[PDB]
Amino acid sequence: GATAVSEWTEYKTADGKTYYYNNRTWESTWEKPQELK
Predict the structure, then answer these.
(1) Of 18, 29, 26, 31, nearest to 7 (Cα)?
(2) What top-level class would CATH report for the domain 1-37?
(3) Where do the WW domain residues begin and end?
(4) Strand partners, 8
(5) Residue 18: which residues within 8 A CB-CB, separation 6 or more?
(6) Which residue, among 37, 13, 14, has the nearest Cα to 28 in the 3D structure?
(7) Domain boundaries, the chain
(8) If DSSP states are collapsed to H, E and C, what string results for the chain?
(9) Taking a C-beta distance cutoff of 8 angstroms, is the pair 1, 25 a contact?
């Protein structure tokens, strides 16, 4: 579930694209999480 915030980790591609990985649903989206907005 949630580690009480910070469940979304940023991962950058060499070209500088930031996709946010959420450990709650194992989701990797280019959308910016509300817990990190």
Answers:
(1) 26
(2) mainly beta
(3) 2-35
(4) 22
(5) 10, 11, 12, 30
(6) 13
(7) 1-37
(8) CCCCCCCEEEEECCCCCEEEEECCCCEEECCCCCCCC
(9) no
